[PDB]
Design a protein around this ligand. Structure first.
Ligand SMILES: Cc1cc2nc3c(=O)[nH]c(=O)nc-3n(C[C@H](O)[C@H](O)[C@H](O)COP(=O)(O)OP(=O)(O)OC[C@H]3O[C@@H](n4cnc5c(N)ncnc54)[C@H](O)[C@@H]3O)c2cc1C
Ligand code: FES
Lengths: 296, 98
């Protein structure tokens, strides 16, 4: 079986062939008007019809069709709201969508289809949803376990869900009493997501929480090395390694794929100096559901 | 209850040994093979892969569309082999009449 929570878990209550039509109740830009790339926190209604759990995710089907008269395929988004939602009624579900925009090798400014359909949603609009999807990023059953959360960009999403249940809420079947460690890597402070919140969490229980930001552009460590999501972990590499060998330490990674290389790099060097080669060790961790990735 | 599977990765060409009641991606993270995965539920195109010599079971479609089951495409994270298989992993599509 699994060390992860799978009691009240469900998947595919809705599929691309017949999605749940929710409605945008809220949609706000949570990045400073001067950040490299806008990210938006948005809230849809579900009427409790989608009992997703911390860690899972929902799919969205943008309106219309692509340059071929065919309905757009489903795009996935990690759920940024805990089970009960940002309203406490288990009636909503929230998303942290980064809006995709780049210029191509022709000088044409392109826009991601779904992420843009999402950031432009006007409260009241219908949004087609699918899921809940995923069981890999679920939370562990052990409420006293350590839990490292490595996140980059909208990759904070599932962890923001995690934390909401770990502190901003009180359940008669769950009481976090271990350590919740978060590492968020972004390029600017105008790009930090939910800092205020992680600020209140760091007080609601400063004994169980520990947050470390990694503003890559406005931060450097030793040799003026840009403070990356993994460069931040470097400064704790010692304490960190002394955890990566206990039955109750569960690591979670999520976000822009690529933030995964560095992490293994600072992990290989650390392990390749004590035990086997990091790689084969990650295999022993994933054995007991202690290293769950979901990069994209 | 243990079929032979071949992975033509843009790296080399694996020669795994995947069983029946076991997803392919899972056996890739076992022998120490590194293949793309995201949701690991079968809802995205992170682990796509055009199949060849053989057949596999991917009933937990979710992202598997119409002519996707015919074109041969496979979601390595959600597919058990029903015969010896030869897939071309890391394969992607983001256009073609789109
Ligand atoms: C499990 C999972 C969870 C996810 N969670 C989130 C989340 O919480 N928040 C979020 O915002 N997204 C998330 N995503 C990503 C999301 O699903 C989409 O991939 C993203 O929003 C872009 O889709 P789109 O429809 O807007 O754009 P699309 O039109 O699909 O465009 C994407 C395509 O644009 C091209 N492209 C992308 N970046 C560049 C670049 N820098 N330069 C040049 N070409 C480029 C590539 O060909 C790419 O395939 C997740 C994905 C998965 C699998
Ligand atoms: S890992 Fe997402 S579809 Fe295979």
């Amino acid at each position: 079986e699994s060390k992860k929570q799978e009691e009240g878990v469900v998947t595919n209550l809705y599929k691309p062939k017949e999605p749940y039509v929710g409605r945008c109740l809220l949609n706000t830009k949570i990045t400073g008007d001067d950040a490299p790339g806008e990210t938006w926190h948005m809230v849809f209604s579900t009427e409790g019809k989608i009992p997703y759990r911390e860690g899972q995710s929902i799919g969205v089907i943008a309106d219309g069709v692509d340059k071929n008269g065919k309905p757009h395929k489903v795009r996935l988004y990690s759920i940024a709201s805990s089970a009960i939602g940002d309203f406490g009624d288990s009636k909503t579900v929230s998303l942290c969508v980064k809006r995709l925009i780049y210029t191509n090798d022709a000088g044409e400014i392109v826009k991601g289809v779904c992420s843009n359909f999402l950031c432009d949603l006007q409260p009241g609009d219908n949004v087609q949803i699918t899921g809940p999807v995923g069981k890999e990023m679920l939370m562990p059953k052990d409420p006293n376990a350590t839990i490292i959360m490595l996140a980059t960009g909208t990759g904070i999403a599932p962890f923001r869900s995690f934390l909401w249940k770990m502190f901003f809420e009180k359940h008669d079947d769950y009481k976090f009493n271990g350590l919740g460690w978060l590492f968020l890597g972004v390029p600017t402070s105008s790009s930090l997501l939910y800092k205020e919140e992680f600020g209140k969490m760091k007080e609601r229980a400063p004994e169980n929480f520990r947050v470390d930001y990694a503003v890559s552009r406005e931060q450097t460590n030793a040799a003026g090395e840009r403070m990356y999501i993994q460069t931040r972990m470097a400064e704790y590499k010692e304490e960190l390694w002394e955890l990566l060998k206990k039955d109750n330490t569960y690591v979670y990674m999520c976000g822009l794929k690529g933030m995964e290389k560095g992490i293994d790099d600072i992990m290989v060097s650390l392990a390749e100096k004590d035990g086997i080669d990091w790689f084969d060790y990650k295999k022993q961790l994933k054995r007991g559901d202690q290293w769950n990735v979901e990069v994209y | 209850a243990t079929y032979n599977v071949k992975l033509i990765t843009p790296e080399g060409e694996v020669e795994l040994q995947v069983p029946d009641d076991v997803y392919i991606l899972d056996q890739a993270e076992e022998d120490g093979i590194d293949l793309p995965y995201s949701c690991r539920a079968g809802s995205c195109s992170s682990c796509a892969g055009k199949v060849v010599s053989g057949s596999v079971d991917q009933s937990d479609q979710s992202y598997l569309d119409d002519g996707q089951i015919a074109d041969g495409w496979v979601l390595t994270c959600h597919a058990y082999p029903t015969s010896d298989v030869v897939i071309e992993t890391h394969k992607e599509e983001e256009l073609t009449g789109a």
